[PDB]
Design a protein around this ligand. Sequence first.
Ligand SMILES: O=C(O)[C@H]1O[C@@H](Oc2ccc([N+](=O)[O-])cc2)[C@H](O)[C@@H](O)[C@@H]1O
Ligand SMILES: [Zn+2]
Ligand SMILES: [Zn+2]
Ligand SMILES: [Zn+2]
Ligand SMILES: [Zn+2]
Ligand SMILES: [Zn+2]
Ligand SMILES: [Zn+2]
Ligand SMILES: [Zn+2]
Ligand SMILES: [Zn+2]
Ligand SMILES: [Zn+2]
Ligand SMILES: [Zn+2]
Ligand SMILES: [Zn+2]
Ligand SMILES: [Zn+2]
Ligand SMILES: [Zn+2]
Ligand SMILES: [Zn+2]
Ligand SMILES: [Zn+2]
Ligand SMILES: [Zn+2]
Ligand SMILES: [Zn+2]
Ligand SMILES: [Zn+2]
Ligand SMILES: [Zn+2]
Ligand SMILES: [Zn+2]
Ligand SMILES: [Zn+2]
Length: 731
Amino acid sequence: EQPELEARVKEIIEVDGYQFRDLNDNGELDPYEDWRLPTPERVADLVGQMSLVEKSGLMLINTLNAACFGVLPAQADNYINTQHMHRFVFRNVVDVRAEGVECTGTGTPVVSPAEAATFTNAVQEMSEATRLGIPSLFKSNARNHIDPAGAFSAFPKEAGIAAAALGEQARRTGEATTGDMSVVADFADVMGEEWASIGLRGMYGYMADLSTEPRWYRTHETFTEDAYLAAEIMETLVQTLQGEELTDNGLALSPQTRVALTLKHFPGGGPQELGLDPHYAFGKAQVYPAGRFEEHFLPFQAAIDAGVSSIMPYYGVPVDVPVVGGEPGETYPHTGFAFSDSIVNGLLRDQLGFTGYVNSATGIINDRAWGLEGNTVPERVAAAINGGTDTLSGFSDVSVITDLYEADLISEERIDLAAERLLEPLFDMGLFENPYVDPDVATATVGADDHRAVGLDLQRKSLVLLQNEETDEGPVLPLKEGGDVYILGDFTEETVESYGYEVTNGNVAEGEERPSAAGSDYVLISMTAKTNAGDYVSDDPSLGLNPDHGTNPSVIIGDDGEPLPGLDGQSLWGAADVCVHKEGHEENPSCTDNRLRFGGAYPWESSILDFTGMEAAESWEVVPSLETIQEVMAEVEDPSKVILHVYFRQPYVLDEESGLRDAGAILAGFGMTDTALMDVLTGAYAPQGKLPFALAGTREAIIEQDSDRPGYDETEDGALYPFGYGLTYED
Ligand SMILES: O=C(O)[C@H]1O[C@@H](Oc2ccc([N+](=O)[O-])cc2)[C@H](O)[C@@H](O)[C@@H]1O
Ligand SMILES: [Zn+2]
Ligand SMILES: [Zn+2]
Ligand SMILES: [Zn+2]
Ligand SMILES: [Zn+2]
Ligand SMILES: [Zn+2]
Ligand SMILES: [Zn+2]
Ligand SMILES: [Zn+2]
Ligand SMILES: [Zn+2]
Ligand SMILES: [Zn+2]
Ligand SMILES: [Zn+2]
Ligand SMILES: [Zn+2]
Ligand SMILES: [Zn+2]
Ligand SMILES: [Zn+2]
Ligand SMILES: [Zn+2]
Ligand SMILES: [Zn+2]
Ligand SMILES: [Zn+2]
Ligand SMILES: [Zn+2]
Ligand SMILES: [Zn+2]
Ligand SMILES: [Zn+2]
Ligand SMILES: [Zn+2]
Ligand SMILES: [Zn+2]
């Protein structure tokens, strides 16, 4: 009964034989401070006592990073006392800093697990110190995946976790449908304990988006293209991270909730047109040529039914999509999902039954109010809140919500309803009783030996064997013991040496002679492709306003009957950026798309996913360069002695002209260490993963495939490797 209670500013009061935290510091037990009453009654009493601005402060969520290790940043006082915010996004890398690190510049420091816990405890202490002592919630993007983070236990990327899951279901069933969720559960158990231990109880994620459009740069963090497998992953992720104890309101929230998920990006951010992402003005559009809008919010249905705490809608504009459960011929507003009542209030809450709160994507008011290009900031804030969005990521100006209330552009009925939905989980999660964590217990949880072992295990099972030729001497893989080995790509020489091979290193500096691979028993290449689009400028005549770069075929007709600027299907790629069309209320607006900060290629190269194409592209880079790989593969005798490990960050195309298909073995890796790849390469473990998305063999397939449809079975050329494909060793 008596829950653990910590209080560093307000004090504890004993009542009816129990102890309670006096958070209003009135000296008396208020029903909201009484942990014995149902959550609704505590909310009602708390909401009852709050000022208007106090309730408005709940509708904001903003970056609050530790600074230098783990001091509170400049804006903490302003956010907590002037804006009355209680929701923050924590973005520092958590790891052990190398000797010598001298905090300098205006970057974002690395902090140890205890330093992070110390910083988040300080924020909770500043929160306790506010008039009513409401606690704080921190959110974070994922931290547990290898970037091919810090001291968090390392796992393959999301698609690698699905690969492991599919492949373990096949090794026990001979079938790859929706996977063995024990793999996912085992992953999420490690993430939960490590996050909770630093006082990190909220997540911007995971992504339920489907990888049905291979040209979308964010396929790097999607699990799969299959709605049904996504649905099963979402279900297990919520059950493991939030728990299976549901409130009467149907939310998996207890004090035993380690991380409350904000599933993103509703209703599904996968089917972007030409793969262009709506962080940017040319990529506002989401299109559904195969009519799978219903399929794409299916994982969200599964997460909602398991009680996910929160939903983040995406920036995208759904084009000509029938309202689900509406009168025929009706379509959803051609505006960002977060501003459409039909989506946030109608689809999500009425049709899919969501009873939680809604968290906008970051920066929808100032930067990405798609469909509301001409509207003001106060107008955009009102439309988002009135459409159904309860908290605004990236907006930190509480006075705008209060001005809108006094101008009757938002009601007290709406703000109260927001306050109740945002406050509810903090209550069910037990943060009103104890919101603190032990820094020292963080140091013993984040990156524990058994946690790293579960990751390494998931790493080894994520690897997908695509190709393993049978030579005269048997299959290429596993490697035979010992030999001369050529390495190229991100291989650590000594690590490969340590398995007892004499290693020739083809990775040399620019001004240096690469040793030839001639006479090698084995060539190990580890390769990928990156975008390199940091030079992009929307209003530069040589780039975004360059007629030689073509036109943006995306058409979005505004509900008002006229096309959105730059999206009439005839305009220069850059013309959609506000710095070009200037329809806002600002003198010389800055460009939203410059430097393509978030990822993705130049929009006019978004369809170049084949390695030959990418080598030649302006804003794509093959690493190591396709030229070098091809030199190397010819210097060896039989290409059958080259083993390609490919990081398919996007469903890249092994095109026939590149010759990569001539390798004796090809593997799909979704993020792993040298030592985990070597253990599978040498046969200490057999590969058993299966593809969670299909791979194509021609650029024509990439351009023909329906952005909302999984696979390439509707194309002339079709798939090189189907979903669910993966070899193993056969002895
Ligand atoms: O990380 C966030 O805040 C969330 O919003 C979006 O990412 C942004 C991050 C920073 C900024 N910014 O600094 O302006 C803008 C956008 C993503 O679409 C979403 O997946 C993510 O969880
Ligand atoms: Zn006092
Ligand atoms: Zn009190
Ligand atoms: Zn009221
Ligand atoms: Zn105030
Ligand atoms: Zn407050
Ligand atoms: Zn990427
Ligand atoms: Zn189920
Ligand atoms: Zn788009
Ligand atoms: Zn303000
Ligand atoms: Zn009034
Ligand atoms: Zn302690
Ligand atoms: Zn543990
Ligand atoms: Zn054999
Ligand atoms: Zn030696
Ligand atoms: Zn020309
Ligand atoms: Zn060019
Ligand atoms: Zn317009
Ligand atoms: Zn104006
Ligand atoms: Zn050369
Ligand atoms: Zn497709
Ligand atoms: Zn053809």
